[PDB]
Amino acid sequence: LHHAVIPHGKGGRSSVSGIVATVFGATGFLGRYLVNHLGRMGSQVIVPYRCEPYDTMHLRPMGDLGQIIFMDWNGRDKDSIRRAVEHSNVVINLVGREWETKNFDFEDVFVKIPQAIAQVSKEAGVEKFIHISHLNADIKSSSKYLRNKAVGEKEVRETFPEATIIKPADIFGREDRFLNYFANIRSLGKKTVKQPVYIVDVTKGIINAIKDPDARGKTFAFVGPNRYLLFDLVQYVFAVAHRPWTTRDKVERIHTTDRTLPHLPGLEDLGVQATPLELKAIEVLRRHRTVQPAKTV
Amino acid sequence: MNLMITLLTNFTLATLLVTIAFWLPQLNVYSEKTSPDPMGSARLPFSMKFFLVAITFLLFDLEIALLLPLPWASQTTNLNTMLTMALLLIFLLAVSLAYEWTQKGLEWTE
Numbered sequence: 018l019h020h021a022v023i024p025h026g027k028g029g030r031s032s033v034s035g036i037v038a039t040v041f042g043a044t045g046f047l048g049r050y051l052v053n054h055l056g057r058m059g060s061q062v063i064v065p066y067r068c069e070p071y072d073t074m075h076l077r078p079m080g081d082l083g084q085i086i087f088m089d090w091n092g093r094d095k096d097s098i099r100r101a102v103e104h105s106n107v108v109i110n111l112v113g114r115e116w117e118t119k120n121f122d123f124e125d126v127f128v129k130i131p132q133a134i135a136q137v138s139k140e141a142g143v144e145k146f147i148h149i150s151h152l153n154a155d156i157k158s159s160s161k162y163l164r165n166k167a168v169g170e171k172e173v174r175e176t177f178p179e180a181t182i183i184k185p186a187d188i189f190g191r192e193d194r195f196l197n198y199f200a201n202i203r204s205l206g207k208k209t210v211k212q213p214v215y216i217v218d219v220t221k222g223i224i225n226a227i228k229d230p231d232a233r234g235k236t237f238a239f240v241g242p243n244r245y246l247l248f249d250l251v252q253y254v255f256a257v258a259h260r261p262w263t264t265r266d267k268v269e270r271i272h273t274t275d276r277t278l279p280h281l282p283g284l285e286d287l288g289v290q291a292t293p294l295e296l297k298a299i300e301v302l303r304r305h306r307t308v309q310p311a312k313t314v
Numbered sequence: 315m316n317l318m319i320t321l322l323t324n325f326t327l328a329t330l331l332v333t334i335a336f337w338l339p340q341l342n343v344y345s346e347k348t349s350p351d352p353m354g355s356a357r358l359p360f361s362m363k364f365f366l367v368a369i370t371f372l373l374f375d376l377e378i379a380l381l382l383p384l385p386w387a388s389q390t391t392n393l394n395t396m397l398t399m400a401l402l403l404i405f406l407l408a409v410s411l412a413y414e415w416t417q418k419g420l421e422w423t424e
């Protein structure tokens with residue numbers, strides 16, 4: 018171990034945590050709270066950004082001086098990825114889109130970018146790699162999202178054999194697109210079962226997978242403590258939020274049930290107590306205000 | 315007809331400007347804001363004084379409504395009667411003001 022990366026201090030803001038993290042896609046919903054929780058330990062966080070630097074401003078209070086290093090990257094360029102990962106001891110991949118664009122489809126985002134990041138981090142001497150897939154990823158799935166995400170999971174597992182793959186089901190938080198999608202839709206009720214996981218639990222799980230050496234090469238499934246049907250979940254969201262842009266792929270993924278994977282470990286094996294929806298859904302949905310809790314299965 | 319077309323055109327232009335001002339900045343995708351005053355949560359207490367100056371306006375505006383045909387009333391052939399009633403109406407507006415003065419009516423909106 019090198020001398021500059023030995024953990025010192027009391028784990029606060031100006032301490033040293035020994036984590037040199039490269040978070041691809043840190044300018045999103047999960048990268049926000051991940052760079053927050055890494056920066057409060059005193060980690061050297063490298064944020065490659067595609068967007069305007071203005072859209073990185075909220076990542077700047079998250080650490081001490083010189084702790085977040087912003088740099089440009091292209092998702093089709095291995096050279097900028099190598100420029101961003103050649104000093105890191107852990108590489109987290111959070112690059113994703115709910116919809117396809119003209120320049121990037123689901124295959125450009127979920128398959129080629131994670132394979133490129135994991136392969137270039139394999140040839141750069143990175144110890145720890147973390148890939149974030151979806152719990153309902155399947156090759157023969159109805160949605161192109163989950164199909165290309167399962168293919169990208171398979172490619173990351175075959176190009177970085179020690180990679181930690183993480184399956185959150187449907188993450189809710191303040192900047193999510195799960196409870197805020199339901200609160201503004203004003204689609205229906207079906208036989209779909211969902212267990213949503215909370216974003217601070219996902220972030221604590223990602224960090225406890227960074228710190229654990231026994232999480233190398235595992236596949237985790239981050240799920241909440243309660244499975245809900247889709248209809249009474251949506252009605253409970255309308256009940257908390259005091260109420261009476263889309264694609265067909267999002268509709269295919271809301272009406273797809275969250276699969277139970279008992280053979281994969283979860284948040285309880287990373288020391289994370291799963292926070293239920295009834296404690297944090299008010300914190301999420303107090304924004305939408307101008308309550309009987311939902312029945313499980 | 316020309317006046318109605320002009321009113322319709324001005325209302326249409328104002329509606330189009332308010333429509334642009336409520337549709338054009340909405341097409342920016344910036345960020346949704348979480349957790350979106352001198353008094354905390356209290357009821358607005360009713361003030362007697364603002365209601366008094368409102369009713370005083372209403373009564374003197376009625377007296378103005380009586381005074382408004384004077385530029386036409388000065389053309390009459392009964393000018394002694396007309397001058398007497400014109401001076402009488404402006405004097406009654408002044409007596410309403412003097413009674414509003416002297417009985418502590420114009421207070422803290424003086």
Ligand SMILES: NC(=O)C1=CN([C@@H]2O[C@H](COP(=O)(O)OP(=O)(O)OC[C@H]3O[C@@H](n4cnc5c(N)ncnc54)[C@H](OP(=O)(O)O)[C@@H]3O)[C@@H](O)[C@H]2O)C=CC1
Pocket residue numbers: 041042043044045046047048067068092110111112113114115121125126149150151152184185186187188189194195
């Ligand atoms: N409900 C959830 O949140 C769940 C999410 N996941 C997965 O977790 C990951 C992160 O989730 P989330 O925060 O919600 O996603 P976001 O859309 O909020 O964040 C995606 C990040 O990746 C960047 N990015 C997107 N497309 C590209 C691209 N083509 N090239 C380069 N950078 C790109 C975005 O930057 P920019 O601002 O420039 O677009 C942003 O920084 C995703 O892979 C998602 O599939 C898994 C399970 C559940």
